[PDB]
Amino acid sequence: XXXXXXXXXXXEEIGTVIDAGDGIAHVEGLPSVMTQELLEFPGGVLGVALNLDEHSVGAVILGEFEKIEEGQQVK
Amino acid sequence: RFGRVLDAEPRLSALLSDYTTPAEGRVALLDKALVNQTAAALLSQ
Amino acid sequence: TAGRVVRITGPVVDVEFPRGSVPELFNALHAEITFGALAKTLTLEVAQHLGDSLVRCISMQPTDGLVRGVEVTDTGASISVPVGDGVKGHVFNALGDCLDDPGYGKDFEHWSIHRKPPAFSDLEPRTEMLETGLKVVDLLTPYVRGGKIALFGGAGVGKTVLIQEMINRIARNFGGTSVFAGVGERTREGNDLWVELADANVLKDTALVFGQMDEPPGTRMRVALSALTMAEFFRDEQGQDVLLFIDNIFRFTQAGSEVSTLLGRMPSAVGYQPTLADEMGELQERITSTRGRSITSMQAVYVPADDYTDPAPATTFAHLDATTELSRAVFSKGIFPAVDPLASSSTILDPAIVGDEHYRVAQEVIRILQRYKDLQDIIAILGIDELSEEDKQLVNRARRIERFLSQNMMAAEQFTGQPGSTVPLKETIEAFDKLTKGEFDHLPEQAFFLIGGLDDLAKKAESL
Numbered sequence: 171x172x173x174x175x176x177x178x179x180x181x182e183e184i185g186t187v188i189d190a191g192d193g194i195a196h197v198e199g200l201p202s203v204m205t206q207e208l209l210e211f212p213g214g215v216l217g218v219a220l221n222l223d224e225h226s227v228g229a230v231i232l233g234e235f236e237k238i239e240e241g242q243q244v245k
Numbered sequence: 246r247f248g249r250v251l252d253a254e255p256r257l258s259a260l261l262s263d264y265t266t267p268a269e270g271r272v273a274l275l276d277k278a279l280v281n282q283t284a285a286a287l288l289s290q
Numbered sequence: 291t292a293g294r295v296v297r298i299t300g301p302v303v304d305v306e307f308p309r310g311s312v313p314e315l316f317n318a319l320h321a322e323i324t325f326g327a328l329a330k331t332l333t334l335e336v337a338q339h340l341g342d343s344l345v346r347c348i349s350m351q352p353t354d355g356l357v358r359g360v361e362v363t364d365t366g367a368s369i370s371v372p373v374g375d376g377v378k379g380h381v382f383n384a385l386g387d388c389l390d391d392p393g394y395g396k397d398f399e400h401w402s403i404h405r406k407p408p409a410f411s412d413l414e415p416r417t418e419m420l421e422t423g424l425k426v427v428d429l430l431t432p433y434v435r436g437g438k439i440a441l442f443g444g445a446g447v448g449k450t451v452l453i454q455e456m457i458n459r460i461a462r463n464f465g466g467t468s469v470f471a472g473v474g475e476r477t478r479e480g481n482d483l484w485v486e487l488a489d490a491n492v493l494k495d496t497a498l499v500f501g502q503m504d505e506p507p508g509t510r511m512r513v514a515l516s517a518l519t520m521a522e523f524f525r526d527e528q529g530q531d532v533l534l535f536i537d538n539i540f541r542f543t544q545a546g547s548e549v550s551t552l553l554g555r556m557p558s559a560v561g562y563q564p565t566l567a568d569e570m571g572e573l574q575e576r577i578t579s580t581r582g583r584s585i586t587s588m589q590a591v592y593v594p595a596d597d598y599t600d601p602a603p604a605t606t607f608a609h610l611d612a613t614t615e616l617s618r619a620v621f622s623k624g625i626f627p628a629v630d631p632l633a634s635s636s637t638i639l640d641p642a643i644v645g646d647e648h649y650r651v652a653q654e655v656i657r658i659l660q661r662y663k664d665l666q667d668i669i670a671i672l673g674i675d676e677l678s679e680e681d682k683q684l685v686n687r688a689r690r691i692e693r694f695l696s697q698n699m700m701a702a703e704q705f706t707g708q709p710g711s712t713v714p715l716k717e718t719i720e721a722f723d724k725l726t727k728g729e730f731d732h733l734p735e736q737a738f739f740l741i742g743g744l745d746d747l748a749k750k751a752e753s754l
């Protein structure tokens with residue numbers, strides 16, 4: 171019975187930059203992102219997801235980090 | 246009795262951790278799965 | 291029921307488990323990576339408990355492709371390596387996977403790589419000398435049959451040449467069974483060794499475990515334990531005498547530091563992990579010749595920036611019975627194998643073990659070279675001519691003694707084309723006694739380079 175209840179309860183992802191500084195960024199969301207996945211930001215900028223914490227993902231920014239700012243969508 | 250169940254069932258206990266998830270669905274699931282009306286009322290409270 | 295990944299930081303991975311099903315330390319866990327051509331099964335080793343049913347693990351493979359939330363299953367046992375007489379002749383990695391034959395060894399007996407060192411009561415010190423046939427080693431740093439030997443040095447001064455030379459000096463004739471642990475050395479050398487041991491037909495009597503540089507630090511530190519397990523199996527169960535070559539053991543501590551910085555532990559001195567001495571000791575004390583059986587180990591130790599005071603070499607110095615120390619300066623002089631006579635040491639160089647004739651000559655040579663190394667500060671400015679005669683007579687033969695310690699090793703034949711030379715102990719003692727007493731002071735220094743014995747010295751001098 172417990173298994174069926176657990177299944178009943180259990181029954182394109184986009185993240186957001188919460189912090190950004192000097193060539194590194196932290197991203198919220200993206201539960202299904204792979205480590206060292208090549209993320210992309212709105213400004214036509216890429217990033218490498220080095221650290222995956224329990225609440226946010228650390229991404230080193232490749233290229234012009236100037237174009238990144240808090241509240242940007244990352245995919 | 247509910248405490249005995251929640252301790253004996255580790256997976257159900259982990260699922261019962263809901264402060265990060267939407268509390269409404271957690272309450273619905275707990276009520277559906279879980280009697281003394283007042284004890285279950287306190288449990289949902 | 292099983293756990294889930296919840297954090298990833300490089301090779302280190304945190305996993306959450308049900309309330310009561312947390313794995314013990316050093317247990318092995320399996321996880322899946324399914325991206326594509328990068329897909330593989332990761333082995334994680336439990337290193338810490340973080341509380342709240344969460345544990346921190348070291349990945350033996352690169353974590354690239356590992357997504358959060360994937361399930362992780364506990365094997366209930368430590369990383370296990372195959373052991374048995376069938377291990378000999380093949381090449382393995384840290385996880386017990388054969389590289390020459392992928393399925394090989396799956397059906398063999400498996401031993402955990404994590405084991406406690408032998409009881410103190412079963413230890414006994416060794417004193418039997420080992421004759422290698424190298425003049426400087428056999429004279430000033432006599433190795434011990436069943437002891438711990440090490441070769442120190444910086445980059446590009448003769449680790450590999452001298453290590454394969456010692457393989458030729460011992461393993462080529464050793465009646466027992468050899469194990470070779472390549473801990474973070476270059477892979478090309480591993481391939482060269484795998485080819486050479488087959489050319490010489492020694493392969494069938496030795497096992498090889500490789501953990502070369504490309505591998506992440508987590509396995510790069512466990513490779514040593516993986517090979518040591520097979521060595522101590524051959525020691526304790528088969529009762530054979532064993533040779534355990536390891537190159538390079540400094541990379542074990544370096545991988546320890548890499549994983550330490552990720553585990554979150556505070557740094558020590560210049561940037562190594564804490565418990566550095568504890569990890570190195572837990573590794574080294576297992577390599578010991580218990581009563582009635584023997585495991586002769588030769589280790590290579592890297593020394594960054596030639597800083598012999600770096601905590602890692604300074605720590606590993608304590609576990610060794612014989613310590614040959616290479617030097618940049620001696621290498622620049624054209625001396626080979628470039629051993630520093632004054633820094634190197636051996637515990638059995640005492641008259642009770644090696645005899646008076648050997649000890650007296652070794653100590654007189656050390657005295658001459660020490661006086662030379664003290665006069666160097668003047669030699670560098672004013673030349674030899676300023677010295678008084680008691681110092682000049684000494685320096686003239688000091689230079690010759692220094693150069694005569696060189697030898698044309700068998701391994702160097704592939705670079706210089708000159709054949710190799712082996713000399714017996716007695717002839718070396720005779721030669722250095724004659725040198726200290728001055729019976730060869732009339733020959734030029736260039737005559738002494740890379741000779742070998744005395745008859746070859748005469749043959750070379752005659753040509754000049």
Ligand SMILES: Nc1ncnc2c1ncn2[C@@H]1O[C@H](COP(=O)(O)OP(=O)(O)O)[C@@H](O)[C@H]1O
Pocket residue numbers: 444445446447448449450451452626627697698699702705706
């Ligand atoms: N007797 C010798 N004569 C000429 N060259 C030598 C001799 N001994 C060592 N060498 C040179 O020294 C090098 C040793 O490199 P190696 O010991 O592998 O350095 P590392 O282990 O620091 O990478 C070899 O490439 C070899 O050419």
Ligand SMILES: [Mg+2]
Pocket residue numbers: 448449450451475
């Ligand atoms: Mg080398």
